[PDB]
Design a protein around this ligand. Structure first.
Ligand SMILES: CCCCCCCC/C=C/CCCCCCCC(=O)O[C@@H](COC(=O)CCCCCCCCCCCCCCC)COP(=O)([O-])OCC[N+](C)(C)C
Ligand SMILES: CCCCCCCC/C=C/CCCCCCCC(=O)O[C@@H](COC(=O)CCCCCCCCCCCCCCC)COP(=O)([O-])OCC[N+](C)(C)C
Ligand SMILES: CCCCCCCC/C=C\CCCCCCCC(=O)O[C@@H](COC(=O)CCCCCCCCCCCCCCC)COP(=O)([O-])OCC[N+](C)(C)C
Ligand SMILES: CCCCCCCC/C=C\CCCCCCCC(=O)O[C@@H](COC(=O)CCCCCCCCCCCCCCC)COP(=O)([O-])OCC[N+](C)(C)C
Ligand SMILES: CCCCCCCC/C=C\CCCCCCCC(=O)O[C@@H](COC(=O)CCCCCCCCCCCCCCC)COP(=O)([O-])OCC[N+](C)(C)C
Ligand SMILES: CCCCCCCC/C=C\CCCCCCCC(=O)O[C@@H](COC(=O)CCCCCCCCCCCCCCC)COP(=O)([O-])OCC[N+](C)(C)C
Ligand SMILES: CCCCCCCC/C=C\CCCCCCCC(=O)O[C@@H](COC(=O)CCCCCCCCCCCCCCC)COP(=O)([O-])OCC[N+](C)(C)C
Ligand SMILES: CCCCCCCC/C=C\CCCCCCCC(=O)O[C@@H](COC(=O)CCCCCCCCCCCCCCC)COP(=O)([O-])OCC[N+](C)(C)C
Ligand SMILES: CCCCCCCC/C=C\CCCCCCCC(=O)O[C@@H](COC(=O)CCCCCCCCCCCCCCC)COP(=O)([O-])OCC[N+](C)(C)C
Ligand SMILES: CC(C)CCC[C@@H](C)[C@H]1CC[C@H]2[C@@H]3CC=C4C[C@@H](O)CC[C@]4(C)[C@H]3CC[C@]12C
Ligand SMILES: CC(C)CCC[C@@H](C)[C@H]1CC[C@H]2[C@@H]3CC=C4C[C@@H](O)CC[C@]4(C)[C@H]3CC[C@]12C
Ligand SMILES: CC(C)CCC[C@@H](C)[C@H]1CC[C@H]2[C@@H]3CC=C4C[C@@H](O)CC[C@]4(C)[C@H]3CC[C@]12C
Ligand SMILES: CC(C)CCC[C@@H](C)[C@H]1CC[C@H]2[C@@H]3CC=C4C[C@@H](O)CC[C@]4(C)[C@H]3CC[C@]12C
Ligand SMILES: *[C@@H]1O[C@H](CO)[C@@H](O)[C@H](O)[C@H]1NC(C)=O
Ligand SMILES: *[C@@H]1O[C@H](CO)[C@@H](O)[C@H](O)[C@H]1NC(C)=O
Ligand SMILES: *[C@@H]1O[C@H](CO)[C@@H](O)[C@H](O)[C@H]1NC(C)=O
Ligand SMILES: *[C@@H]1O[C@H](CO)[C@@H](O)[C@H](O)[C@H]1NC(C)=O
Ligand SMILES: [K+]
Ligand SMILES: [K+]
Ligand SMILES: [K+]
Ligand SMILES: [K+]
Lengths: 348, 304, 199, 199
């Protein structure tokens, strides 16, 4: 396009330069409008662009005749070629490059189903102020470029969130987000997909790809059935002992329902135990005023004092309730919930 | 103390600042990767503080960002005032008021440039970022103007390029959230800044004429005549009452119509699309006393 | 990762842009700067003795300007100063530059236009009296180009010889700085590749 | 394969283009070349005796040019030369061509414009003295067109008779060469068809 455009422009400017200087043979060459070559180049760019100032124009008969034929051809040539050239330049990939790790601060790679609302809900529950002073950075990785609302969301979190466009299957893109030094990798799922076995297949393929690059990473993922969760244990690097957890939504939603089949309303309490909610004070006397005080509690994890070692489990739950105002539920030296008075507090 | 045209000192200060810092950065990246071949921290903590201050994540960051917005428009207005002045002229700093206000604006831009330098991840990518190049061609030569007690309307038209920042620093302040009006402020900022900047360049070129005729091509245009020239040209009207007469002026106009015609034809109907999208049948029904009404829903077509 | 980053790619693009800008500006200055300057140097610095000094009486129009854009058009008388060349040794006219020659070829000197026609006439008479004193003696280091304007002899060339310096200097400076940017970026990348692969 | 190739199709297209170009250029030259030339030949070559030679004193403006684009406007006096026609036998003016007549109808001769108004006046006086010597005798082979300009008599026609040759020649040459291309390509194809089908 550039060769045809510039050659047609310079050639037709040369022809109108020859015609306008050596004037019309019918007046015995008294029509010599003395134009330079560059004035004719400027004439044709003003003409092709349909600006047409009129400071410079062809005055001879042969000059006007060529200009009639030139606008019949050259106007369509300009209007077709110039926006296409500007399309072919300027196609630059925006979110290229690579993540640069910093010392003394770890980071997190998030892949999978990344949209505006999923990232918004994630950044609400992750960067909540009810945690401690967290300092992990959140690196995203999605092949689709983000729209303007996601870019405004990433500008709202300019120091905590970086985006990088790539595919998790391609190992060069895994090398770009520093997946070898990431603390964990999170795979969000499109929970309202049209074919659940299809996206379970796709997310299983994502786990295979990340474990193919680096096997010693901690992968957290979401599955939509239980048999597709069973396929993940067959992967030779899927080690749940170090923390490869598969959050199966079918198993968890039906188990929450069944535990509420025993004690009605437990599933609401359990689901509220993980959404990070600050305290909301209600001045009236509604059911929401006491419900929201139940909402503001979250499940946490902590080691115990040395002063509690050797005591019994009902003893330490009673005294932390009355002195520290905390409700202890379970223990770890396994993960069994609510032991009797016969089991004593181990150290650590 | 007239006669000596010291216009070159301003342009030299801009070029030395841009290219000298560029060479210092590149030489740092060669010496620190020669040092092995041939022969949480605290700086990250001040980097995260600057990165918080550049965004609007605090109160003082919000105050800084609103100051960047307001003083960018203020520096542009000072260019509009100074554009009617002659090209090379003297001014005493203690008597010229607008030189003092311009001093206050550019020392603020110097501190904000320092914050953006600290907050960046890549010093080379920051040094080639377009909002830094505007600072390299505007912030040094006003300090040279206060040192010489002499002004030159040089590349002060690049102050109009600061309006590119407006959609970003409104995205920081939670003012722009949805995608349509993010896109609308983006199109408006790029359109107006390109129009005003290119008008300033053709104003400088057309006034200080061609150096090949020993500057006998001074078509004395005002700044607003060049703004009117470029709007007549971009729209492909082209009256011919006002046009560029110098060689450098026509040369820039050739490059400007190659770019600016596609910019006008793409951006203007899209802007007019994003405005004017008003919901027609909004509002609510207002009941009247002593007369009841009927709500009809479902399959509503013309024939039904 | 043995590949350019975004900043190094943009820096290579900047260095290539400065290389193209230096070549294109040299290409522009060849037709704008160089060619009329070489036409100026085509005129030969020669000797000339003054032949005579004449007035015609046909006055011409200057344009005096006040502060707030006045366009007053005063008038001024004309003096023709004819000289005897050393090269052609013919009846040649005297001119101050090509500027005075092109605005009015029929005179030898155009004053700075003032408001009073008496003041313009006095500027003519002072310059004419100086060119009426030194007659015959001290042949002048004047300039002449018999191939284009063989009838007129100038007193000063329009373009300095340092024009030829600045026409070739700053495109070359632009070329050198652009080459230095591409070289330094490539050298920094290759040394960083070797420094990371040395472990 | 009994069909045109791509080269023969392009050659037939070229020959058809030259046929169209010859017809269109003849159509263009009919309005540009032919019609003012036929208006020239409409003027009749006649005889004329010189009546008298007058000056008016009303001077007019010429434009003398130096080498590097001077636009000096010297002035020149006017001579009217009146003749006695052979056809109409009325008071008619003399002119050198339509060019001199259209730039200034009120004179009979315009000199080449020089710098000095004295030199233009001397060119007028030499041409006037030649047209003051030969008075009454030797009636001139002049030209005249009473239907359009019955008051002015020219000395030379603007267009030659060979204009009528070149107006019809090169469109005909273009037509003949285009016809020859189409004929030779079709003849070469048909002979190649017969030469391949002869086996
Ligand atoms: C690719 C990189 C290459 C760049 C090349 C850079 C090199 C630049 C060039 C280099 C050399 C130029 C300096 C030499 C000057 C010589 C002195 C002189 O001529 O005095 C003249 C000052 O006349 C004026 O009035 C000056 C006013 C304009 C000055 C501002 C120039 C800005 C040029 C645009 C800046 C655009 C910057 C664009 C930036 C993007 C007086 O002459 P005169 O009185 O009028 O003559 C009368 C004739 N007479 C004597 C017969 C009567
Ligand atoms: C389809 C095919 C057909 C093509 C047709 C080709 C046939 C071509 C034509 C054929 C005939 C033309 C030749 C005859 C000339 C006659 C002599 C003459 O007139 O002298 C004149 C030379 O005046 C000049 O100054 C000449 C300078 C221009 C010459 C270059 C011509 C290029 C034409 C464009 C080439 C484009 C090529 C385009 C190619 C694509 C002098 O006359 P005068 O002094 O000024 O008169 C003063 C009046 N007065 C006497 C009263 C004062
Ligand atoms: C968003 C931010 C808003 C935009 C920021 C805009 C900043 C520009 C402020 C202009 C200040 C200024 O020009 O001072 C002028 C105020 O003269 C006046 O009277 C102006 C009245 C309004 C102040 C002084 O001009 P002067 O009166 O001519 O000075 C006397 C000189 N003299 C003694 C030679 C006469
Ligand atoms: C000197 C100028 C004086 C200082 C005034 C500068 C305004 C700064 C706005 C900051 C702000 O309050 O944003 C808040 C609301 O803001 C809005 O949603 C609407 C804000 C007004 C509309 C834009 C006006 C410009 C954002 O907070 P939130 O999201 O609504 O919670
Ligand atoms: C003054 C600037 C303030 C702009 C207000 C922006 C705004 O409020 O957005 C609103 C109007 O939607 C728009 O975007 C219209 C704003 C166009 C102003 C363009 C200014 C830049 C032009 C530069 C020319 C400089 C010339 C200098 C010479 C809508 O915002 P929103 O996306 O819907 O936000 C979510 C809803 N919320 C408001 C409830 C939170
Ligand atoms: C050029 C015009 C640029 C401003 C036009 C404009 O922003 O209109 C806007 C406000 O506009 C107003 O409410 C104030 C009217 C100011 C228009 C006159 C400016 C001069 C109209 O915008 P909107 O359609 O009402 O809101 C949609 C914006 N959104 C999609 C971001 C929510
Ligand atoms: C002679 C000296 C004076 C000359 C006068 C100067 C003429 C004006 C030149 C300044 C205009 C360039 C700035 C600009 O257009 O932004 C561009 C850079 O994208 C960015 O956002 C900036 C990143 C760098 C944004 O546009 P884009 O990215 O290139 O592509 C648009 C595609 N898109 C709409 C899908 C995004
Ligand atoms: C919206 C905000 C509007 C901002 C508008 C700026 C005010 C206009 C200034 C007018 C002015 O200064 O007159 C000066 C020149 O003026 C002219 O001669 C040209 C006519 C003005 C061009 C109009 C373009 C509007 C720019 C688009 C708007 C900006 C884009 C949007 C930006 C947000 C004075 O003229 P003068 O020196 O005395 O001589 C002139 C000769 N004359 C007298 C024969 C005429
Ligand atoms: C990129 C590469 C850039 C190549 C640019 C070529 C250098 C320009 C030469 C200028 C010049 O020679 O001046 C001559 C004429 O000039 C003019 O009078 C017309 C003004 C120039 C037209 C600009 C068109 C640019 C062509 C688009 C670029 C090419 C397309 C891209 C190709 C790759 C000298 O003028 P003059 O004889 O003394 O008389 C003029 C009258 N005046 C003094 C009143 C003005
Ligand atoms: C990249 C380029 C454009 C940077 C700017 C360099 C040029 C334009 C500048 C820097 C050095 C300057 C020169 C310095 C010395 C000479 C002689 C002196 O008595 C007055 C100024 C004068 C005549 C200047 C002309 C312009 C100048 C040549
Ligand atoms: C970008 C920053 C860090 C560096 C900018 C370089 C500036 C400060 C330097 C480089 C060129 C210098 C000029 C060089 C020569 C002139 C004329 C001389 O008689 C006095 C100093 C004066 C007026 C200087 C002013 C300051 C100056 C403009
Ligand atoms: C006045 C100007 C020129 C000062 C220049 C300071 C430059 C040379 C120095 C100061 C701090 C440096 C940075 C320090 C650490 C970062 C992150 C690292 O992972 C890659 C290099 C990088 C990006 C360096 C690039 C060069 C750098 C920006
Ligand atoms: C000239 C410039 C460097 C002046 C800036 C002063 C710097 C050294 C001071 C002023 C503000 C300070 C910051 C204030 C609070 C933040 C968050 C806190 O949780 C840890 C320390 C940290 C990150 C501080 C680091 C040092 C600091 C950045
Ligand atoms: C001719 O010109 C030179 C200067 O170029 C001068 O010095 C010399 O005296 C002149 N020669 C004669 C013979 O006049
Ligand atoms: C003066 O001019 C005449 C002719 O104009 C010439 O023959 C002679 O050489 C010249 N003499 C001098 C001293 O220049
Ligand atoms: C008239 O013109 C012819 C030339 O065409 C000339 O030979 C002849 O002498 C003239 N006739 C008379 C009677 O003068
Ligand atoms: C001269 O002119 C007169 C009238 O102007 C006319 O009657 C006569 O025929 C002419 N005589 C000659 C010899 O041309
Ligand atoms: K148009
Ligand atoms: K038009
Ligand atoms: K037009
Ligand atoms: K027009």
């Amino acid at each position: 396009l550039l060769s045809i455009f510039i050659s047609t422009w310079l050639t037709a400017a040369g022809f109108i330069h020859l015609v306008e200087n050596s004037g019309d043979p019918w007046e015995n060459f008294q029509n010599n409008q003395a134009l330079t070559y560059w004035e004719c180049v400027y004439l044709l760019m003003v003409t092709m662009s349909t600006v047409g100032y009129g400071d410079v124009y062809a005055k001879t008969t042969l000059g006007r005749l060529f200009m009639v034929f030139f606008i019949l051809g050259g106007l369509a040539m300009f209007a077709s070629y110039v926006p296409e050239i500007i399309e072919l330049i300027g196609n630059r990939k925006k979110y290229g490059g690579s993540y640069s790790a910093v010392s003394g601060r770890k980071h997190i790679v998030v892949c999978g189903h990344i949209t505006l609302e999923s990232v918004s809900n994630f950044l609400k529950d992750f960067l909540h102020k009810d945690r401690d002073d967290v300092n992990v950075e959140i690196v995203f990785l999605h092949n689709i470029s983000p729209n303007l609302e996601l870019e405004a969301l990433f500008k709202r979190h300019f120091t905590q969130v970086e985006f990088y466009q790539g595919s998790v299957l391609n190992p060069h893109d895994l090398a770009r987000v520093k997946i070898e030094s990431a603390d964990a990798c999170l795979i969000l799922a499109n929970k309202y997909c049209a074919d659940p076995d299809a996206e379970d297949a796709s997310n299983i393929m994502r786990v295979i790809s990340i474990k193919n690059y680096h096997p010693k990473i901690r992968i957290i993922t979401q599955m939509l059935q239980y048999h597709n969760k069973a396929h993940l244990l067959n992967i030779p690097s899927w080690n749940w002992k170090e923390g490869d957890d598969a959050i199966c939504l079918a198993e968890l939603k039906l188990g929450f329902i069944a535990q509420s089949c025993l004690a009605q309303g437990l599933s609401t309490m359990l689901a509220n135990l993980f959404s990070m909610r600050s305290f909301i004070k209600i001045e009236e006397d509604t059911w929401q005023k006491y419900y929201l005080e139940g909402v503001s509690n979250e499940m946490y994890t902590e080691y115990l004092s040395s002063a509690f070692v050797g005591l019994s489990f009902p003893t330490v739950c009673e005294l932390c309730f009355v002195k520290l105002k905390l409700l202890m539920i379970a223990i770890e030296s396994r993960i069994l919930i609510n032991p009797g008075n016969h089991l004593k507090i181990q150290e650590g | 103390s007239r006669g000596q045209r010291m216009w070159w000192a301003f342009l030299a200060s801009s070029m030395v600042t841009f290219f000298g810092g560029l060479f210092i950065i590149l030489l740092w990246r060669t010496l620190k990767y020669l040092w092995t071949v041939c022969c949480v921290g605290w700086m990250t903590s001040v980097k995260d503080w600057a990165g918080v201050m550049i965004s609007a994540q605090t109160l003082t960051g919000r105050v800084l960002v609103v100051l960047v917005f307001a003083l960018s428009i203020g520096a542009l207005v000072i260019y509009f005032i100074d554009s009617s002045n002659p090209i090379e002229s003297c001014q005493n700093f203690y008597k010229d008021f607008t030189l003092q206000i311009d001093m206050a604006f550019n020392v603020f831009f110097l501190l904000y440039f320092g914050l953006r330098f600290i907050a960046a991840n890549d010093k080379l990518w920051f040094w080639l970022e377009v909002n830094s190049v505007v600072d390299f061609f505007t912030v040094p030569p006003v300090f040279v103007s206060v040192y010489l007690n002499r002004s030159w309307l040089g590349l002060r038209f690049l102050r109009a390029l600061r309006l590119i920042q407006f959609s970003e620093i409104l995205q920081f302040l939670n003012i722009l959230k949805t995608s349509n009006s993010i896109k609308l402020v983006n199109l408006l900022s790029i359109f107006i800044s390109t129009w005003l900047t290119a008008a300033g360049f053709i104003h400088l070129v057309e006034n200080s004429g061609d150096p090949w005729e020993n500057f006998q091509n001074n078509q004395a245009l005002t700044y607003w005549e060049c703004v009117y020239l470029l709007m007549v040209t971009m729209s492909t009207v082209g009256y011919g009452d006002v046009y560029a007469k110098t060689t450098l002026g026509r040369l820039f106009m050739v490059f400007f119509i190659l770019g600016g015609l596609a910019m006008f034809a793409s951006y203007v109907p899209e802007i007019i699309e994003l405005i004017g999208n008003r919901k027609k049948y909004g509002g609510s029904y207002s009941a009247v006393s002593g007369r009841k009404h009927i709500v009809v829903c479902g399959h509503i077509t013309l024939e039904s | 990762a043995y590949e350019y980053t975004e900043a190094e790619d943009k820096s290579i693009r900047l260095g290539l842009f400065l290389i193209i800008s230096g070549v294109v500006s040299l290409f522009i200055f060849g037709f704008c700067w160089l060619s009329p300057a070489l036409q100026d140097l085509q005129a030969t610095e020669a000797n000339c003795t003054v032949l005579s000094v004449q007035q015609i009486g046909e006055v011409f129009e200057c344009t005096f300007t006040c502060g707030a854009d006045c366009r007053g058009t005063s008038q001024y008388p004309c003096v023709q100063v004819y000289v005897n060349n050393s090269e052609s040794n013919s009846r040649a006219l005297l001119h101050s530059d090509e500027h005075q020659l092109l605005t009015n070829p029929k005179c030898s000197y155009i004053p700075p236009c003032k408001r009073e026609n008496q003041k313009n006439l006095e500027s003519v008479m002072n310059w004419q009296q100086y060119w009426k004193d030194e007659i015959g003696s001290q042949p002048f280091t004047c300039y002449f180009n018999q191939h284009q304007r063989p009838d007129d002899v100038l007193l000063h060339r329009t373009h300095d010889e340092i024009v030829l310096l600045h026409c070739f200097l700053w495109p070359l400076v632009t070329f050198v700085v652009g080459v230095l940017i591409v070289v330094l970026t490539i050298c920094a990348k290759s040394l960083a590749v070797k420094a990371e692969a040395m472990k």
